[PDB]
Amino acid sequence: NIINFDTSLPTSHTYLGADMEEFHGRTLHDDDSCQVIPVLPQVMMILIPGQTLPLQLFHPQEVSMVRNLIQKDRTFAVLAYSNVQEREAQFGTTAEIYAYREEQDFGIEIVKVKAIGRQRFKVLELRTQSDGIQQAKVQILPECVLPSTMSAVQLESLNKCQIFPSKPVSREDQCSYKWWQKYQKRKFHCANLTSWPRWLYSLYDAETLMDRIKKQLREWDENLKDDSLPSNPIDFSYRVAACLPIDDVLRIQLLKIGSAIQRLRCELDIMNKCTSLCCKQCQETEITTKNEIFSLSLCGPMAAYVNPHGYVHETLTVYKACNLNLIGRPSTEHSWFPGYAWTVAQCKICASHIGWKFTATKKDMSPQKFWGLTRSALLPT
Amino acid sequence: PFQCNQCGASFTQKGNLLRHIKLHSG
Amino acid sequence: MSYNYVVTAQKPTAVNGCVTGHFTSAEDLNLLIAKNTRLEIYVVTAEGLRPVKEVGMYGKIAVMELFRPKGESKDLLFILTAKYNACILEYKQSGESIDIITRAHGNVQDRIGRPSETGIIGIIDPECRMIGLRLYDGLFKVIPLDRDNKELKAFNIRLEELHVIDVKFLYGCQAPTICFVYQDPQGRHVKTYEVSLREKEFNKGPWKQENVEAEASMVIAVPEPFGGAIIIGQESITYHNGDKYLAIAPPIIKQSTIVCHNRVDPNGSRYLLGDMEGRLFMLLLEKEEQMDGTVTLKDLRVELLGETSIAECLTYLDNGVVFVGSRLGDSQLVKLNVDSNEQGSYVVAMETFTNLGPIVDMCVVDLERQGQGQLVTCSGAFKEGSLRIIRNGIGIHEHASIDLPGIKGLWPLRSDPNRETDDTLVLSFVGQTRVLMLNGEEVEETELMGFVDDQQTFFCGNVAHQQLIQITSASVRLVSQEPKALVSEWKEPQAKNISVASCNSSQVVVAVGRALYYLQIHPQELRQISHTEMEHEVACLDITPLGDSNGLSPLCAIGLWTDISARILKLPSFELLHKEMLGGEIIPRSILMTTFESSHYLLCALGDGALFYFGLNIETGLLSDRKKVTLGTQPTVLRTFRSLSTTNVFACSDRPTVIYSSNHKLVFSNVNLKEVNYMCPLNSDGYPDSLALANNSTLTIGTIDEIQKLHIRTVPLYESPRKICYQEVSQCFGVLSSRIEVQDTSGGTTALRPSASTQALSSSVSSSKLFTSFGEEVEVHNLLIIDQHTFEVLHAHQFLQNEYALSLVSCKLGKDPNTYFIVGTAMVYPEEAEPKQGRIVVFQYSDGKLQTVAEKEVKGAVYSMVEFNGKLLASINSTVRLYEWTTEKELRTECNHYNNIMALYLKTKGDFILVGDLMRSVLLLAYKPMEGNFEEIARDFNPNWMSAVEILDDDNFLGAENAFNLFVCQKDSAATTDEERQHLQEVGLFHLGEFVNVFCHGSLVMQNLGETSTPTQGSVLFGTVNGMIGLVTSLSESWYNLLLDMQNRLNKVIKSVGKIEHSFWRSFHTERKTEPATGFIDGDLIESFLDISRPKMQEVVANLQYDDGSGMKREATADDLIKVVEELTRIH
């Protein structure tokens, strides 16, 4: 079920435009400190560091705020929305601008900006400015890194037996179930000094957890070896958390976790314990079960795209989707996928908008076999 | 020009567009 | 708000490094051993190892190498601490005092850097030009070795190779040359660099990089005339020299990989090798080739010597003796005899040094004496596994019991000349002296003819010339053995009363009133030679001959009741050779002179229960050596019982003790008895080698255990023991253990050696149905029932194949009066990653057999189990479950709790439950009995590695975490804010320096009400990987403040080896952050307050304000401090 498509245009966000003022990322923070950052309202999105955000700006005061941010530290703060409305926020992330284009178009200003997350934080207070853009008191959250669990109890003499030869070949049977067995046998050999077996220590190994997650991802859809998957557990965990089909509360729980190992364990538990989905306002459907969650993009099954009216929707690309009805013609105006034509998909029961049917425009592609859902109404069970 | 914004649904009249808008509401 | 006090009850024993060289003197050959925080210095003698110095440092020794720079008479010692504390030490002694001075010291850590994953490497130039250190990946640290480098300043050299396996300096090089083996994506290569100092960069190596075996690990440098380096891998040992290159692949080294090595010859012609499973090789080099004077290597023969302990480190002592140091088993001394070959083994074990590490689990039991507990640990791994039983003091094994209503004194007697066996014990009361006769175990009383039946005898001892001298209260009336008639009787001419009696084998120096007359024991006569009078009342008399002669005492010191002073005077005279006035107020109780192992001493026991140790000079006079220890709380009578081929002294008092010398310093033991007032050695025929201890209530005879403060008994199992628990109703221990069984080429598994699980009395195999390649090794987990008396494995239950026994509990449940063994296991398969199913199995040991009353299958891995008010509280995967035991002998679920953490650790204190995981995510529960559901009282999540937990109290929680630290959490239910009642405040930090595996409640001292109790509350022990036993007990706020002030004052006085600050070491250390210790009092530092001199003891205390119960007392004294620290030392 493979189609000759270049999985770089959905990430490139070519639907907005091409003549974009490319900006290089050179922002950071002093780690675990108090800061003040302006917040752009009217955004309902839990954002993870490394996740791409496409934004459309309409109100003049928001345009002024983003322009001042550009002539400043070009980082705003995406707030974390819980179930309770009215800015019931306790966490958030900092988004960095790398993508600025104004274009007053019909004489407005419509700043089109694309940003990604860089750091996490917690809001201490939400100060409201009379201008219309609230600047909140921000405490930057450090990202903890932990050493190997065998470093403390390791035997000094058998430390030379700790550099294993590089992994043999790739994606080959018995090149993993034996190499990893030997790796566990030789790495956590000092577990005999403690009260816990080797497999328990491998349950907390950063490398082993990433290997398990990679196996599960390949079970979902074929990933091209090291298909842009970072070797660092930090970025790997962040990417996995970004691509998982989970609701807002699960995303904020993954965001508050401060250690990569705990994040990887939580993600592996989530995708080994959640199989059935549903849509809000029904709580009665199971459209698009896990075993068919494809990924027709570099970033993964889930990504962020924006309509021509500022509204941002995160979509889930799946192979098949039943229990749906169609309204409207297969338009090709502002489809986020250049080689596809979009159609409005309505829920067959609650008639609350979930999904978009897609059709064919070319030859070497999948004709009318495509679906992109939304997190507007999508929860796991 | 009758077209929804929360969704993207397109219409040739206004009654169904308003029905869609109020269905989005709530 | 924690106020905890932590102290060490047993120092670490595992060896992590050892060297030899001329450290103490240029002529002596020393063996230096690093245990952990301790450095041990020996002298290699013909007999064996002679201890010289025992010194502990403020860190964990990671690098320890002896080097002798040009212009130095004896070798120096470089030590690197795991906190990157570098120092150079020089041994120095001045007559009798020994001090390890620090020539240079410093800290070599970097501001930013990821520590290397292959560990710390410390190497030294053979020409002593610099020290190479590999502390971080991609950086090589160089310490130039100059006389001006007192701060140990180092510079970094960028190593383009990130992964470096092993590096060592080469011999016979014009410039300092390192030759390291490193890793690439293309494989493993050996490279060599020419380290430069002026340019501060590397250079071109002597020879080119060579591709080596894909698993080459270790490098050894071959001294001249060979040169080059030998690269030892897992399959082939190769010799590289550039132009020269040889390589063999011996088949004897393919079973296990070599991890350690040692050079036996100064020219490097032979080498020693040791591997993981503990056998010893011998790499031999042939220097046959000789072209024009130069000699080059020709062959690389490899031979097998035998089998030793699992060697952490080797070192070849002189004359065929090899010290095989171990870190997970007993250290050893072996002999490389060449012509013996008893069975194909060239090694014969000479010595064996006790090693308690690692400790995996422990239980405090009262095995022998009620009230005083004992420690039984799970020590060792693989073939070195065993059990160690630890008890404090020297116990007394009673063999008789008699009723003595307050006997005022017991003295030996032999009413049979030429019999060599005592027959009657001369027991003297306040009014009568009855000589009880017991040929065997009789309770008869045969009165002596020469002894007055109605008299409080002061002395009854055998005299020469077949006579018995009995200095009774009335007078010194002698007696005879055969005729049973009083040959002589020295009545008082002035009708005075005999107050103090002290007679030797031939001399008798007694005092009546204020006058003391020295009367010799003439043959069948009582003739004196001198007389004198004392200014004050003679409180006690001590006239004992010293070593040799044994016929006349050169000196006779006495105690004055009204003066409280001791003056040395000769027996035939009265002049005071030397004067001493130790103590005061209360009159001395008993004066004694000691001669422990060619060390003449004189001990004075005051009436307040304190003993003042002091040396003596054989010729004339004596030193002072002013030091007093409160060895009890009542007046004590000091006697001498040899019983060891050494003098020894029994200090019978409210707290009995034995004063003993280990090497040359006297030490104090403890006798595990309630209270012994009077005692005497008795080598009776019916009771041989005994010690008649007559207490204040009854008389008994027993034997001394040993002359050691701590006694460790080893029970070898030849397999790894995992968990241990005690069942008193059956008087047996339950031990989980595992042996390695290798799959042979027959479809089964074969054991490597006989084990305690395959050499048991009876056995059983788990039989239930609730549910690769040849040479692979798998673990077989067994449950062993061990007898509490003979420590023989009574049973060996074998679990299901591929089943891992995780936890073990011995408890009774519900209304069933039987006690059970409950084991929770996990079925682990290599294909899967997280266990899916596991078992909870209940055993019962009755009638010498193990049965299985009930098994319960669970969907998870039962990591821990505890007993919860007669119910079972199991931890299945990431849930905690409460189980109810019915009358149907089956478990039923009673309550669950779904967490997001793996409940590895479970505790219970009343209705509280402490839950933790390996990520230090502590969580507190509470069982609501009226409603039967757990409630989360509070939470505390902080990403770290947690090793153990414990409940200090209902509001305090102790734990051990990453980088060998300790911490204490505490809940505050009194807070009125809800977001804080669900938060655990961290109120304590500490850097223990050890990796704790287990926490246990109890203590090794005898528990008594004591009325006043102790300043400390509770008692928690712990055992670590290095094999050390600690103790932590809570404190009061005032005591905590006073001890913190004391600790701050001691650090300004105590100078530590390496000049490492105590505040820096105890600070809570982590790879990302560091913060000072709070809420913990260092017990070792406070205990070291008694070992300092009087001037320093005065410098420590100036403004403590010790007085708390009213009063300030700005002086706060210094002997007041002794009383406080003595009580703190008495608790372990």
Ligand SMILES: N#Cc1ccc(N2CCN(Cc3ccc(COc4cccc5c4CN([C@H]4CCC(=O)NC4=O)C5=O)cc3)CC2)c(F)c1
């Ligand atoms: N003040 C002021 C002011 C000034 C300027 C304004 N503008 C008016 C003119 N606009 C141009 C225009 C309108 C309409 C379209 C059609 O596309 C639409 C429309 C509506 C919703 C959605 C889509 C597509 N779509 C999804 C489908 C799935 C997918 O794959 N991708 C998507 O985008 C939607 O959900 C394209 C361009 C732009 C400027 C203004 F509105 C206010």
Ligand SMILES: [Zn+2]
């Ligand atoms: Zn629906």
Ligand SMILES: [Zn+2]
């Ligand atoms: Zn809509």
